[PDB]
Write a protein that binds this ligand. Sequence first.
Ligand SMILES: *[C@@H]1O[C@H](CO)[C@@H](O[C@@H]2O[C@H](CO)[C@@H](O[C@@H]3O[C@H](CO[C@H]4O[C@H](CO[C@H]5O[C@H](CO)[C@@H](O)[C@H](O)[C@@H]5O[C@H]5O[C@H](CO)[C@@H](O)[C@H](O)[C@@H]5O)[C@@H](O)[C@H](O[C@H]5O[C@H](CO)[C@@H](O)[C@H](O)[C@@H]5O)[C@@H]4O)[C@@H](O)[C@H](O[C@H]4O[C@H](CO)[C@@H](O)[C@H](O)[C@@H]4O[C@H]4O[C@H](CO)[C@@H](O)[C@H](O)[C@@H]4O[C@H]4O[C@H](CO)[C@@H](O)[C@H](O)[C@@H]4O)[C@@H]3O)[C@H](O)[C@H]2NC(C)=O)[C@H](O)[C@H]1NC(C)=O
Ligand SMILES: *[C@@H]1O[C@H](CO)[C@@H](O[C@@H]2O[C@H](CO)[C@@H](O[C@@H]3O[C@H](CO)[C@@H](O)[C@H](O)[C@@H]3O)[C@H](O)[C@H]2NC(C)=O)[C@H](O)[C@H]1NC(C)=O
Ligand SMILES: *[C@@H]1O[C@H](CO)[C@@H](O[C@@H]2O[C@H](CO)[C@@H](O)[C@H](O)[C@H]2NC(C)=O)[C@H](O)[C@H]1NC(C)=O
Lengths: 60, 108, 104, 255, 46
Amino acid sequence: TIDVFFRQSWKDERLKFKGPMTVLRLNNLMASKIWTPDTFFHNGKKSVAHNMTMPNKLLR
Amino acid sequence: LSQVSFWLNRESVPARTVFGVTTVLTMTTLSISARNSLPKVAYATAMDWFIAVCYAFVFSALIEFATVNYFTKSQPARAAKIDRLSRIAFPLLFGIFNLVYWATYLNR
Amino acid sequence: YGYTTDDIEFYWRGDDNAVTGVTKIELPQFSIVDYKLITKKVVFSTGSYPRLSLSFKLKRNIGYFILQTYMPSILITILSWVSFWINYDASAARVALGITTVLT
Amino acid sequence: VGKIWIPDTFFRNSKKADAHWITTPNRMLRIWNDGRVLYTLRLTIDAECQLQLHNFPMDEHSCPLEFSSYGYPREEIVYQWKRSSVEVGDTRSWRLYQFSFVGLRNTTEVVKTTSGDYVVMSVYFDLSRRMGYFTIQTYIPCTLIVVLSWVSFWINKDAVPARTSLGITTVLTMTTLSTIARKSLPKVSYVTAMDLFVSVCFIFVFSALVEYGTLHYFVSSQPARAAKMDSYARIFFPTAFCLFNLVYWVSYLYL
Amino acid sequence: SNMSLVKETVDRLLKGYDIRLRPDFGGPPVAVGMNIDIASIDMVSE
Ligand SMILES: *[C@@H]1O[C@H](CO)[C@@H](O[C@@H]2O[C@H](CO)[C@@H](O[C@@H]3O[C@H](CO[C@H]4O[C@H](CO[C@H]5O[C@H](CO)[C@@H](O)[C@H](O)[C@@H]5O[C@H]5O[C@H](CO)[C@@H](O)[C@H](O)[C@@H]5O)[C@@H](O)[C@H](O[C@H]5O[C@H](CO)[C@@H](O)[C@H](O)[C@@H]5O)[C@@H]4O)[C@@H](O)[C@H](O[C@H]4O[C@H](CO)[C@@H](O)[C@H](O)[C@@H]4O[C@H]4O[C@H](CO)[C@@H](O)[C@H](O)[C@@H]4O[C@H]4O[C@H](CO)[C@@H](O)[C@H](O)[C@@H]4O)[C@@H]3O)[C@H](O)[C@H]2NC(C)=O)[C@H](O)[C@H]1NC(C)=O
Ligand SMILES: *[C@@H]1O[C@H](CO)[C@@H](O[C@@H]2O[C@H](CO)[C@@H](O[C@@H]3O[C@H](CO)[C@@H](O)[C@H](O)[C@@H]3O)[C@H](O)[C@H]2NC(C)=O)[C@H](O)[C@H]1NC(C)=O
Ligand SMILES: *[C@@H]1O[C@H](CO)[C@@H](O[C@@H]2O[C@H](CO)[C@@H](O)[C@H](O)[C@H]2NC(C)=O)[C@H](O)[C@H]1NC(C)=O
């Protein structure tokens, strides 16, 4: 068993913006409307994406 | 095995004591391990009655040895007669009980 | 998770009576001696985050282990002492006693 | 059900509970023309019952089932039992093996919490443990091991290994019986009736072995001591055990 | 009726409410106070 913060980062030029902020710190809920990678573990057996009290995800 | 003890020399007091107590403890072990195949019901089952009667037979064999030891060196003929009668009665009665049990519960 | 300390700040409402119900907890194997509330910040590669900490101190009851392991051990050791009164000629008895106590 | 307002009733002492969904959600709604709404659903609940296991296995308990609203205090939601409120069925097809259902009662109280004062409804089910499994499992075995220890008093005192073997085997199997008996209870710290009975049986078998040890010790200095001691044990052990049984059962039954 | 007031109020409060943004999204941080009511500590497993 292993408990991890798994961090991914990529470039989506469709999501460039210009405003008073340089970084938008959005919840897990925004990451569902954009494309994200379909990363899986090859030797994984039955994993957990924790969602208490909310989906423990972060998009920026 | 408990009944085999009746065919030993009356001077083998440690040997027959071992026989008796080890068979009684084996009966206790078997009862404890067989009570786990069942759920924890509050009543006795046919298997429980069979194990109880087997325990009674083993304990009776031990009591018979204790008696014949009590009567050796003071009434050897009585001890010899008790051993001889046991050698016949115990296996015969065990066979009778088995016939009755297995005819009772296998025909319901 | 995702908000840093420049977005969100945690505290305990009441600052000590934030937590209730600890005094009524019944554990058959432990006893809650003390509990505390803490407020601090942690730092990961993605920034700094607020944190609250609730902590309990559990003291294990000894009675079960007294009646379960220590009493049998002491009784077996006493049973082992019993052989010192048997005469040396009775070898089989003393050997059986000592071996049973040791192996048990 | 999900389109009208539904009260947020929850069960306060449930470790876990679930609704039923086979083959569809086991739920029913009925609405009368005056606006009266009846909502029923099937539930399976694991509910905590803090057991005081003193007097085990002759232990009787009142297990509660408490429910209230999660977010509406007494000013907003009030619960009320009807006259015909809690109905049990045949009770014979239930899964109570070690316990028998005595009866039930209902109560209603007001609990104060961190978010307000809430009407709390309770049902109490009375359950009395059945003394039929632990009899066969512990009481007859321990009693038979004590009698097996007594058997040592009619063995000739000169046969040291025989009687010492009987003694040590009886003590070791009493230890095993104690462990097996305790395996049923949770790891509580206090002493229960079963522990009392098993400890007394152990004292009995160890007293038999100590009696034989003393008999062997005194056969070298004063034989008549041992000669009388054997008969004294033969008469004192069964009598003392029967008296202990009388005291023990009269105590733990009428209590 | 108080029902109409409450309904109008609840509709107005949720009129154009962006769940994606926190209170004071670009401003100072929001302070969250926590209470805990422990109902049971069930099984301490070694
Ligand atoms: C962290 O992540 C977790 C994992 O995602 C997450 O858990 C999930 O939470 C969500 C939301 O809370 C759950 O979704 C709800 O499930 C309710 C039922 O829950 C039980 O059943 C599911 C399986 O559900 C199937 O079966 C029921 C009944 O048969 C169907 O109603 C379902 O649609 C679904 O059917 C599909 O799947 C079947 C195979 O299973 C197929 O055969 C079938 O054909 C369908 O394909 C179990 O998984 C649940 O177990 C979990 O939860 C329990 C909770 O106690 C745990 O103990 C357990 O361990 C599991 O964790 C559970 O047993 C649904 O009722 C519910 O849907 C209703 O509500 C939503 C919200 O409003 C509506 O959008 C939805 O449309 C439904 O409303 C309609 O239906 C009700 C009747 O139920 C009507 O009364 C209502 O008016 C409305 O009707 C209208 O719409 C209908 C369209 O549906 C239409 O037909 C009508 O005509 C009318 O217009 C919702 O889906 C999800 O199950 C959880 N999953 C798991 C694995 O936990 C967790 O919450 C997250 N945590 C946090 C903190 O965020
Ligand atoms: C259980 O374990 C926890 C964690 O080890 C204990 O919490 C610790 O509590 C002490 C006393 O409150 C903290 O010390 C404090 O440190 C701050 C740091 O600036 C200092 O300013 C204070 O004066 C005080 O010395 C300690 O930091 C804290 N540990 C952690 C990791 O935060 C707790 O006391 C233990 N016992 C119970 C009953 O909870
Ligand atoms: C369940 O609760 C109801 C309401 O609290 C109890 O109803 C009472 O029943 C008695 C009959 O014994 C009547 O004399 C009272 O007038 C009833 N009270 C009301 C408010 O109607 C009922 O007895 C409870 N059932 C139990 C405890 O088994």
